[PDB]
């Protein structure tokens, strides 16, 4: 019976190139729910990181309303392949080095005209990092999200009201070289030469384990500096003692530094 | 109503393979605004760098003029998918190792017939580098831009009058191994065996932080050369002293150099 309802909707005068109607003439409200699957390849050198996520968008297209009140028809109808539905031309501004597969897509049409869009994407995103504090620093990488063609008069994004950003079970553990401390959903809507475009930015905060770098780098040299001191507690007459101590400690440090 | 205007234009005899008309019979003026998103992977070895940008081209096609004076119609109309508009066959001469996605495109048709073209591209561009001065050098990489098929009689590019080159908020910081000192928009129109083709070249200047390389490479060895001198202030009789000093310093330098 679902194929009979999808038939009734698109047999009409629906144009998937045409922006959905608004009662006020205002923009189309787009609710956004995001789900971070995995994060990897945090490239300090090439200023980029590989993140994999699941995006969920939600808007109201009154044209697609079949049941309206419904309550005698299925709540939503899964859209089958072959029917075009207008969607927000979403793109990632900071996306880089990206080739797109295709399908892992899901489109639901609720009776009131509410559409749910779900998609899986692998993205490489540029992340400017600052290494003044090494190795005890902290970086903040982001995923920007906006429309390309439609301005602020036609479309405006809003983070979903509850849990806008969700993370896979062991994401904090999953990362190879950093530890994820914080997440943050903010807005990054800005004004460019072409116009004012609504934009969402999700952000993760990575800091490194001080423990590792303490044991691997700091503690060894602390022992070497201490060793360089015990030549002071030897008398002046023992030339072979203090010469060997001094020159070896320096050779060791050069190796340690190497 | 925008779909009704786009209909009226292409319902006529518009050929997207035909160069737009000129009142003088002259070339088609193409204004170019460029925006450098991100720069990364500055490969010294393979002589190339990955740069990501947003190109804006602008020309006048009197055929597409719908409102002319307008002032009673929308200033511009966004081009929907399915309509072909003649565009400058722009290509990057120095582009290398490049695969193209697809869409991140934007086409506006102003009432007077002015067209705006916006596009996002990731490019790998060959950059000949000279390392006579290491590490205190400076490199200049460029992005060349020209038409392939059309000669100087049909099309001529001109940098936009104001801020032809624009850079993302933290580009100077974004770079991993170099520091961007200068930017420059010039012309590189040349004359080849096939003809005279108009060409735009944007240029960035990268030089390295002397500070780092000073502390990491130079200062350590300065200490080693000084150490080699203190064997002179020891008397001749102390054979174990000056032998150990001399041979260790040399071993250390070989390691340091390694």
């Amino acid at each position: 019976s679902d194929s009979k309802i999808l038939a009734h909707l698109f047999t009409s005068g629906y144009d998937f190139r045409v922006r959905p109607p608004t009662d006020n003439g205002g923009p189309v409200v787009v609710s956004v729910n995001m789900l971070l699957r995995t994060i990897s390849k945090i490239d300090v050198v090439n200023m980029e990181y590989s993140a994999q996520l699941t995006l969920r968008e939600s808007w109201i297209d009154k044209r697609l309303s079949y049941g309206v009140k419904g309550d005698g028809q299925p709540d939503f109808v899964i859209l089958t392949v072959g029917h075009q539905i207008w969607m927000p031309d979403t793109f990632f501004p900071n996306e880089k080095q990206a080739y797109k597969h295709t399908p892992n897509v899901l489109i639901r049409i609720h009776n009131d005209g509410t559409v749910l869009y779900s998609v899986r994407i692998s993205l490489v995103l540029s992340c400017p990092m600052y290494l003044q504090y090494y190795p005890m620093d902290v970086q903040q990488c982001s995923i920007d999200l906006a429309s390309y063609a439609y301005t602020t008069k036609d479309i405006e994004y809003l983070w979903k009201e509850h849990s806008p950003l969700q993370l896979k079970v062991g994401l904090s553990s999953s990362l190879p070289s950093f530890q994820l401390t914080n997440t943050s959903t903010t807005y990054c809507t800005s004004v460019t030469n072409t116009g004012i475009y609504s934009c969402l930015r999700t952000t993760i905060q990575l800091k490194r384990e001080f423990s590792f770098y303490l044991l691997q780098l700091y503690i060894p040299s602390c022992m070497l500096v201490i060793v360089s001191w015990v030549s002071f507690w030897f008398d002046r007459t023992a030339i072979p003692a203090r010469v060997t101590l001094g020159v070896t400690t320096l050779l060791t440090m050069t190796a340690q530094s190497a | 109503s925008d779909s009704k205007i786009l209909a009226h234009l292409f319902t006529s005899g518009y050929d997207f393979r035909v160069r737009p008309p000129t009142d003088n019979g002259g070339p088609v003026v193409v204004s170019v605004n460029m925006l450098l998103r991100t720069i990364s992977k500055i490969d010294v070895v393979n002589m190339e760098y990955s740069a990501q940008l947003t190109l804006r081209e602008s020309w006048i096609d009197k055929r597409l003029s719908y409102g002319v004076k307008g002032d009673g119609q929308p200033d511009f109309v966004i081009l929907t998918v399915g309509h072909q508009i003649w565009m400058p066959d722009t290509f990057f001469p120095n582009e290398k190792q490049a695969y193209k996605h697809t869409p991140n495109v934007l086409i506006r048709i102003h009432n007077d017939g002015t067209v705006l073209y916006s596009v996002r591209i990731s490019l790998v561009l060959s950059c000949p580098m000279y390392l006579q001065y290491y590490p205190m050098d400076v490199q200049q990489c460029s992005i060349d831009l020209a038409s392939y098929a059309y000669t100087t009689k049909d099309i001529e590019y001109l940098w936009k009058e104001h801020s032809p080159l624009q850079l993302k908020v933290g580009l100077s910081s974004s770079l991993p191994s170099f520091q961007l000192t200068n930017t420059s928009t010039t012309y590189c129109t040349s004359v080849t065996n096939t003809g005279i083709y108009s060409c735009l070249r944007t240029t960035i200047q990268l030089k390295r932080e002397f500070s780092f390389y000073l502390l990491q490479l130079y200062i350590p060895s300065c200490m080693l050369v000084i150490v080699s001198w203190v064997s002179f202030w020891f008397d001749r009789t102390a054979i174990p002293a000056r032998v150990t000093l001399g041979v260790t310093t040399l071993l250390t330098m070989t390691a340091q150099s390694a």
Partner: antibody, heavy 122, light 110 residues
Framework: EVQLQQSGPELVRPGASMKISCKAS????????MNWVKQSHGKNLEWIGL????????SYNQKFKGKATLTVDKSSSTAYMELLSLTSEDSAVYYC???????????????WGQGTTLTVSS | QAVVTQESALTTSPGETVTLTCRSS?????????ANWVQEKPDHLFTGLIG???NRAPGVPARFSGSLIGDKAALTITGAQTEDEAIYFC?????????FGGGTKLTVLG
């Protein structure tokens, strides 16, 4: 603290045109976008348009298309506003208002200038 | 296009709670209107208060607070002060531009 010192009041005749200055101080100028508001005697507070010192882009109200022209000089930390074809109507007090978010349009008003009284009569 | 309607003028006592409304003519004031509130001191002095999604201008008292009571924008001052006596303007975002209102003349009786 921050400051937005505008230009001194001007007296000009209909048909002419002039430019109102607005110097910024106390913050990274290229960071926050700038607004411009018209306070006329007859009408309520009207909104002219806005400008991004870093982008250089501008977006005007539909009413003020051609009436106002926002510009900016990064070297002096100052936003400008030309007013062409001045008449008896354009006589008002003009304020410049900063946005509140750092390198992004947060769509909310921060600091205002003291304003500039423009008296245009013949 | 549309018009923003504020109260003519309101009166309150020091230490009390007062609420200014901001009605839209197109319909309900939603989150996409980014209701702003600007305070006009005498001699043409303006300063922003609440705006955007939850943003506040630096140096805005805690007694000031934004909300959406009913279907219009609300500026609530819990614990009014003598210096909070000024004219309060609210602005709404309609797709591409700001639309101010009439402005409410708040009086804190000294």
């Amino acid at each position: 603290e921050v400051q937005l010192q505008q230009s001194g009041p001007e007296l000009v005749r209909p048909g002419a045109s002039m430019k109102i200055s607005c110097k910024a101080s106390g913050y990274s100028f290229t960071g926050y976008t700038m607004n411009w508001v018209k306070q006329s005697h007859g009408k309520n507070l009207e909104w002219i348009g806005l400008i991004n010192p870093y982008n250089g882009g501008t977006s005007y109200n539909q009413k003020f298309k051609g009436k106002a022209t926002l510009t900016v000089d990064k070297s002096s930390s100052t936003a400008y506003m030309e007013l062409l074809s001045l008449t008896s109507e354009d006589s008002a007090v003009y304020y410049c208002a900063r946005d509140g978010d750092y390198y992004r349009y947060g769509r909310y008003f921060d600091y205002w200038g003291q304003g500039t009284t423009l008296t245009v009569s013949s | 296009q549309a018009v923003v309607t504020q109260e003519s003028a309101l009166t309150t006592s020091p230490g009390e709670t007062v609420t200014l409304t901001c009605r839209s003519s197109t319909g309900a004031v939603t989150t996409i209107n980014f209701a702003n509130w600007v305070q006009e001191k005498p001699d043409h002095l303006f300063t922003g208060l609440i705006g955007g999604i939850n943003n506040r201008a630096p140096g805005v008292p805690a007694r000031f607070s934004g909300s959406l009571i009913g279907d219009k924008a609300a500026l609530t001052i819990t614990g009014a002060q003598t210096e909070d006596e000024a004219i309060y303007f609210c602005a709404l975002w309609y797709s591409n531009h700001w639309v101010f209102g009439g402005g409410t003349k708040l009086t804190v009786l000294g």
